[PDB]
């Protein structure tokens, strides 16, 4: 007896063909299908920041000496101080960048899951109820073709509205 | 009619502008402003700083007192402007550490 459960505090190790998807349970059995548009929408954003972190070319030629074999004093103290200042500032930039990036990546992938859920919520209208775990209880008989119509966005709520409302109340 | 429809929306413009974000090289937004000043009039405004135009004279020449720089005696400035056309016309001279003397007089 395995009941299905959604994304509320729960991932799917079994889904390998996409990043987001649907799992259903109806009269014909249980099934799973990935959602390609939302999977790629999250991937496209990660690709875009991968492109932007590498876009600048840092091309330097003749610079200053950074290693010294003899103690010299004032001028060498200054050359070392300049390079140590540059490294600490770039190290800070690198640390802050990946922190802002990862925070945003976690947010945008969490957002795609919510968008897909709300997109589904709008389709079902008064024919389903939020079970609270990331799943919908569809209050009418919904065969495989009916599940696919929800997955591909052609589900017409008026066809089943009378049946669904009678089961709800 | 027994029912009604109420839509919520936002404005749009025919031709928007491209901007960059963390993830996207170009996003079309309705409007943008430029943050990089890239143009000039070609002229130095004489206010509010006191600009002293060297004309034919370098600061070191006016310090020493080259005859055609006599007009600069006892002068003051916030910014001294040296021109390419400048030239010396007195005794040939050499200043060891010329850049340092120029810096401390100019400062």
């Amino acid at each position, epitope marked *: 007896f395995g009941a299905i459960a959604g994304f509320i505090e729960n991932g799917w190790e079994g889904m390998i063909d*996409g990043w987001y998807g649907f799992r259903h349970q109806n009269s014909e059995g249980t099934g799973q299908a990935a959602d390609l548009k939302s999977t790629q929408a999250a991937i496209d954003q990660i*690709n875009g920041k*991968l492109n932007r972190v*590498i876009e*600048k*070319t840092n091309e330097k030629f003749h610079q200053i000496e950074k290693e010294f074999s003899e103690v010299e004093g004032r001028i060498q103290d200054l050359e070392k101080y300049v390079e140590d200042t540059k490294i600490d500032l770039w190290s800070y930039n690198a640390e802050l960048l990946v922190a802002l990036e990862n925070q945003h990546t976690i947010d945008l992938t969490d957002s795609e899951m919510n968008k897909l859920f709300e997109k589904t919520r709008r389709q079902l209208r008064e024919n389903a109820e939020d079970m609270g775990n990331g799943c919908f209880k569809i209050y009418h008989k919904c065969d495989n073709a009916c599940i696919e119509s929800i997955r591909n966005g052609t589900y017409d709520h008026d066809v089943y509205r009378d049946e669904a409302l009678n089961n709800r109340f | 009619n027994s029912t009604a429809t109420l839509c919520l929306g936002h404005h749009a413009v025919p031709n928007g502008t491209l901007v960059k974000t963390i993830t996207d*090289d170009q996003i079309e937004v309705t409007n943008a402003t430029e943050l990089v000043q890239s143009s000039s009039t070609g002229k130095i405004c004489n206010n509010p700083h006191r600009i002293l135009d060297g004309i034919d004279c370098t600061l070191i020449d006016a310090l020493l007192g080259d005859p055609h720089c006599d007009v600069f005696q006892n002068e003051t400035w916030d910014l001294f402007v040296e021109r390419s056309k400048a030239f010396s016309n007195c005794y040939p001279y050499d200043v060891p550490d010329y850049a340092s003397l120029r810096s401390l007089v100019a400062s």
Partner: antibody
Amino acid sequence: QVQLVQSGPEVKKPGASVKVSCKASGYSFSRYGISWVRQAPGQGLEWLGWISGYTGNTNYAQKFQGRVTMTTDTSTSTASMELRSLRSDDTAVYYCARDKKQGEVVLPAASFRWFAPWGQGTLVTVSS
Amino acid sequence: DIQMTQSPVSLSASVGDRVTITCRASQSIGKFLNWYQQKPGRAPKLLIYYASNLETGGPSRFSGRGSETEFSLTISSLQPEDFATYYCQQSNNVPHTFGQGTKLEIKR
């Protein structure tokens, strides 16, 4: 190996619509996209648009927006390009080319953001 | 649209020559610049992808360099097969834009 095979040449009247097809083999169709490039007689190359074999998403060049619609079919590994309200301006050789990897995050040097391989080309002539 | 400017538009050279053609972008495109070779009656073929990468099976004499706004394609030693038209193309932003092309012609 990896190959794109296009439909035969077409001749059309100014008001009409043309539909070019691109048949793929040698790779997973649904993991990449297809871009469309045309070349007027004695002229340079011009990009029309792109469609993903993974999602069906499309990007059209602004000047063909409204006029073009690109479709893809995973079951037959075929992408199509429809151009409407033709003109003598549209007389050109139309190419399809595999473009952009899909279904996974890719570093730039592995993004396949380049046109390869190309189809043999489809010649479209529009004249009254 | 990002404007790609190729220099020169025409070039005359002999077999065995070393030639370099230049691609310029109106704004930075990173390394998303591709090079295509087109022989007169044939479709274009990819030669260099992502600025410096030789397409598999491509001749070793072809090499590419550059980043951001400046790019170049080099042929170490010209061959009879290499007299053709060469286009650079940017893939960083949509719409994808091509250069006007460089035609390699036989010197005489």
